[PDB]
Amino acid sequence: EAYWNREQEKLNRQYNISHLNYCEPDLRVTSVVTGFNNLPDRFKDFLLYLRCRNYSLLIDQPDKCAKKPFLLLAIKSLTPHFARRQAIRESWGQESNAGNQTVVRVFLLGQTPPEDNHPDLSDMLKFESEKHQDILMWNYRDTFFNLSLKEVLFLRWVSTSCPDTEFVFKGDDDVFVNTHHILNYLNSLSKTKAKDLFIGDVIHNAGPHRDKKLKYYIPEVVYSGLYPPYAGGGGFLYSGHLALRLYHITDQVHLYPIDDVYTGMCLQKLGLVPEKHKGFRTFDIEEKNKNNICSYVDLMLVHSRKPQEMIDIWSQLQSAHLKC
Amino acid sequence: EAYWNREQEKLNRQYNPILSMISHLNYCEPDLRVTSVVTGFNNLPDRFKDFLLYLRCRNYSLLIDQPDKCAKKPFLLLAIKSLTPHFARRQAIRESWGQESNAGNQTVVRVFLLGQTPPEDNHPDLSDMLKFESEKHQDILMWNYRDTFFNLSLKEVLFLRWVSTSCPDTEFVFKGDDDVFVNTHHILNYLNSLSKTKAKDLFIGDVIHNAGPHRDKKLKYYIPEVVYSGLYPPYAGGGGFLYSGHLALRLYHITDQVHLYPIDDVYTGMCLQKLGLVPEKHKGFRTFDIEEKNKNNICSYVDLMLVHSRKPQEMIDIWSQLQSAHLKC
Amino acid sequence: EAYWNREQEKLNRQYNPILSMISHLNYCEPDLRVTSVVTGFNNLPDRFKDFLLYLRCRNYSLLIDQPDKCAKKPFLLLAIKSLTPHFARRQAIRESWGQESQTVVRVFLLGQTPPEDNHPDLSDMLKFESEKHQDILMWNYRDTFFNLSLKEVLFLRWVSTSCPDTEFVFKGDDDVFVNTHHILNYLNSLSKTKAKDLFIGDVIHNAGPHRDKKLKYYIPEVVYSGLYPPYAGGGGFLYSGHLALRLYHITDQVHLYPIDDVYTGMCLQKLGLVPEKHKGFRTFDIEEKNKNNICSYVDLMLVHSRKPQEMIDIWSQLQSAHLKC
Numbered sequence A: 001e002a003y004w005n006r007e008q009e010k011l012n013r014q015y016n017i018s019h020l021n022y023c024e025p026d027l028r029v030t031s032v033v034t035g036f037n038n039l040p041d042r043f044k045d046f047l048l049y050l051r052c053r054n055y056s057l058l059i060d061q062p063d064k065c066a067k068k069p070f071l072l073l074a075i076k077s078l079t080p081h082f083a084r085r086q087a088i089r090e091s092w093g094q095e096s097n098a099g100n101q102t103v104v105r106v107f108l109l110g111q112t113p114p115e116d117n118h119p120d121l122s123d124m125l126k127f128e129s130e131k132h133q134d135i136l137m138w139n140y141r142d143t144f145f146n147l148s149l150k151e152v153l154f155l156r157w158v159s160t161s162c163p164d165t166e167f168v169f170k171g172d173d174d175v176f177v178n179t180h181h182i183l184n185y186l187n188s189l190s191k192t193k194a195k196d197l198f199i200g201d202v203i204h205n206a207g208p209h210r211d212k213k214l215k216y217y218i219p220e221v222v223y224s225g226l227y228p229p230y231a232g233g234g235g236f237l238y239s240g241h242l243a244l245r246l247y248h249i250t251d252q253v254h255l256y257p258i259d260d261v262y263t264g265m266c267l268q269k270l271g272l273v274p275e276k277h278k279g280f281r282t283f284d285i286e287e288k289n290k291n292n293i294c295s296y297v298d299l300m301l302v303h304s305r306k307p308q309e310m311i312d313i314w315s316q317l318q319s320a321h322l323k324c
Numbered sequence B: 001e002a003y004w005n006r007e008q009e010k011l012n013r014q015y016n017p018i019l020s021m022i023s024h025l026n027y028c029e030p031d032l033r034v035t036s037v038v039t040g041f042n043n044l045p046d047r048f049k050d051f052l053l054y055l056r057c058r059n060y061s062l063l064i065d066q067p068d069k070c071a072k073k074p075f076l077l078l079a080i081k082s083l084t085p086h087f088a089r090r091q092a093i094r095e096s097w098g099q100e101s102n103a104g105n106q107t108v109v110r111v112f113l114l115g116q117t118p119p120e121d122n123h124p125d126l127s128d129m130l131k132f133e134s135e136k137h138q139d140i141l142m143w144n145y146r147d148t149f150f151n152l153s154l155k156e157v158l159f160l161r162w163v164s165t166s167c168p169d170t171e172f173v174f175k176g177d178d179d180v181f182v183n184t185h186h187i188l189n190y191l192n193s194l195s196k197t198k199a200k201d202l203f204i205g206d207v208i209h210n211a212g213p214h215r216d217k218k219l220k221y222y223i224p225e226v227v228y229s230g231l232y233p234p235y236a237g238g239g240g241f242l243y244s245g246h247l248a249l250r251l252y253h254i255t256d257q258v259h260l261y262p263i264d265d266v267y268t269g270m271c272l273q274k275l276g277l278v279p280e281k282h283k284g285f286r287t288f289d290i291e292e293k294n295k296n297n298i299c300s301y302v303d304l305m306l307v308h309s310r311k312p313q314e315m316i317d318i319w320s321q322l323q324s325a326h327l328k329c
Numbered sequence C: 001e002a003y004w005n006r007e008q009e010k011l012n013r014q015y016n017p018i019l020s021m022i023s024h025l026n027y028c029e030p031d032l033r034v035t036s037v038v039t040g041f042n043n044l045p046d047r048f049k050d051f052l053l054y055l056r057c058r059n060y061s062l063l064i065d066q067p068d069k070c071a072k073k074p075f076l077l078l079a080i081k082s083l084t085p086h087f088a089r090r091q092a093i094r095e096s097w098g099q100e101s102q103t104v105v106r107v108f109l110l111g112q113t114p115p116e117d118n119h120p121d122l123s124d125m126l127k128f129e130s131e132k133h134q135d136i137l138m139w140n141y142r143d144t145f146f147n148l149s150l151k152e153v154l155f156l157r158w159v160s161t162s163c164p165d166t167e168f169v170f171k172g173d174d175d176v177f178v179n180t181h182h183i184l185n186y187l188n189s190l191s192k193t194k195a196k197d198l199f200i201g202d203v204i205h206n207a208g209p210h211r212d213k214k215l216k217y218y219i220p221e222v223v224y225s226g227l228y229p230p231y232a233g234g235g236g237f238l239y240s241g242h243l244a245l246r247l248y249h250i251t252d253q254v255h256l257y258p259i260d261d262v263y264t265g266m267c268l269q270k271l272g273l274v275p276e277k278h279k280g281f282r283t284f285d286i287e288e289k290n291k292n293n294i295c296s297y298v299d300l301m302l303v304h305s306r307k308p309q310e311m312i313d314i315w316s317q318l319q320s321a322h323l324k325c
Ligand SMILES: *[C@@H]1O[C@H](CO)[C@@H](O[C@@H]2O[C@H](CO)[C@@H](O[C@@H]3O[C@H](CO)[C@@H](O)[C@H](O[C@H]4O[C@H](CO)[C@@H](O)[C@H](O)[C@@H]4O[C@H]4O[C@H](CO)[C@@H](O)[C@H](O)[C@@H]4O)[C@@H]3O)[C@H](O)[C@H]2NC(C)=O)[C@H](O)[C@H]1NC(C)=O
Pocket: A023, A024, A025, A042, A043, A045, A046, A049, A052, A115, A116, A139, A140, A141, A142, A143, A145, A146
């Protein structure tokens, strides 16, 4: 009865009109979806062009994985977030080579076109791309409900341009990440748990928010029932082996407005469950402990932090072992 | 969990551009790891043991060839499966419905498909008579593999290879058993009534949907659960099917991506499914005999394409009566 | 007793090997004997007088020709009957369903609208249109309703000499909308045998001449007696290029008839063939309620009739009709 659930099981019995590169507006949804013309315009645009995901790469760094990476940092960002990206470049997103355990960094961007009243910062983006060589940008509209598109297109770039990275971190450009804690965690892993790695702040048996004022509002007419297990809150860590299997399976899952929920549907179709790890505190530390750098040593991700805070915490963290 | 299903999905991952990050085609030594992973292997019948141990070998060569069989482009290539000692079945087909012709644009050619019946399996050495029969009629194709029941999908793959290298321009292909009567006249009339689009992906026969593997150990099509699990794809079986040369060239290309299966007609269905096509049922394919009440009326043979099964004498008799059934019926 | 039947039976005896024991094709003086052997000649309408007086003439020349229009072997020859002042009709077809693209060619079939019949001189305009689109065929005869069967014959001649290789031929009016997409799907859905003797359209059986003097298809009894053969009329029909030459060769054996579509039926009947009815040929229109719904068009092949702007409109409402039907 809900549109996405109705169309997903239709897609499923196919694998037991194209849904991948039919890029004209499907207008059948206007009469099929109850109350279409009253929904917010993001639902309208999401349902009209759900069946198009063959968008091209505008800005690429094809040599980013010329040397085999051990951990690929892939940070979701928007065009005007220059300070966020530069803070990450200087703090936890530094590229390293501490023993051929190469850590590489890319930012994942869509477009902020002039027709959506975005200011033209494209000439500034290219200068940033030339100088830091860490920008990947595709020609889709970088909107909130196009973030699963951002997920799939990044998975495609890994299959073509970085298929041999050992591990992959994917997060938001406003989360602080303890990369030192992540590296030692990865190094401490058996090669059977490393193969199917997917950890984060996992939530089980969650349903869609129906309050039309909240961020993740999904009406019953669009989706029905409960969400599969999914890591959320702005960061999860998984294997490059799982990343390749993930991208292959995206063909059999329709896009979903919530990107972290879409990634849980792909893991489920693969017969896996994301593993909860307490180190992903997508809800912040208590204000009492924010002044104690030692409250950061044993976590892996804390949301959210401003560009100044990320540089400050990273600087204090470098000499934290002498105080904790 | 079954062995064939497990190995075929391994092959799907090998050919998938994303998921792919010894040969299954020319590894002709015994594949001994099947003795460990196939539960109850050494208790399986001999044909199952030999099928699993050499499943990865299909690069067999022609010992007898008719390389100029399709010099003139044929409208209908008749490809009849046969065994070496079936001299009477083949000769009866030559004199009856398997006659070659050049009737005004519509050329019909004929080949018999043979494997080996070697002396080490106690077969009588009939190679001299076979070479004599080949030189006389020039319609025998023979490959250097053991012609057993569980190697018929090998006979299927090797014939498609021969079509792609020696008869690619044939408009249509009929493949059948050497004991089925085929109304070639009715088949030609049906082929000529086809729209240009229906003739490109033509594949008709006696098709069965949602069929499963026979689990009785004593029947002819027995397949245990250690070998195959689940249901069969749709496939035409029971004596013969009809399809286009365009389809045959597509079929041979896809054969590399499908592991051999002990039932040849099932294997062809697996290839069709992988190609995205579905074989179409045609009621003229009587893989069971005609009703006993009508098995004597020559009328019953004007309106079918194929009937199973007829002895060599019966084929000649029915065909002779067909040459005048237009006035009687 | 009737004139055309009596004269047709004379032709049938002359063309029979056995029964054979002025011309009827290039006698272009007034056949004055019809004034006495046709009872009531003086009181017939003027179109019947001119038809009876020059029935035995048909060696008219090509004033404007596109000689290499079929230099590339066409899959479909679009032949449209049109009158010289119909510039809007022809250009609307050129931009819509008559687009020359399985290569498709297009020709418009015209006679002469001479000044002696009080026609405005549009010759300079026609030559400009012909020089710019290269799709005008015009013969030196009076383009009259009762001369349309003569239009059929001269076009069939032109096919046999200037475009004999065409696979299929469509012949229609310049005011009918034709779904070029749909009809091409029908043509590719044909076996060769059926594609060799194809002749489809709105076929009528056991039709007769209308005898009411004030109707358009009025034919008096002194001209034609009996019923009509099966014939396809009402806007257009589709047939094979092989059938076209079989049609031209035997037009010599059939006297011209005032009703062009009936004449083609007589030509087919003398060939031993029967035209095949096809419900996709809606010579009558479609129900007003089902109009505006573009799906009522992508199912049919021919609809009569539409104005120039409508043809351009429906053709563009068609290129997006698969989204909904
Ligand atoms: C995810 O990203 C994809 C790809 O970027 C997005 O899909 C694109 O979506 C846009 C809509 O935002 C769509 O644009 C429409 O194409 C239609 C084709 O007919 C047009 O109807 C429509 O034209 C409107 O916008 C034009 C430019 O603004 C105007 O020139 C035109 O007059 C129309 O104007 C309407 O909207 C403007 C708003 O500015 C308004 O001022 C006007 O009054 C009028 O109401 C669009 O051009 C693209 O076709 C899609 N691209 C592809 C490749 O498919 C998708 O929207 C994103 N998903 C989410 C959930 O955001």
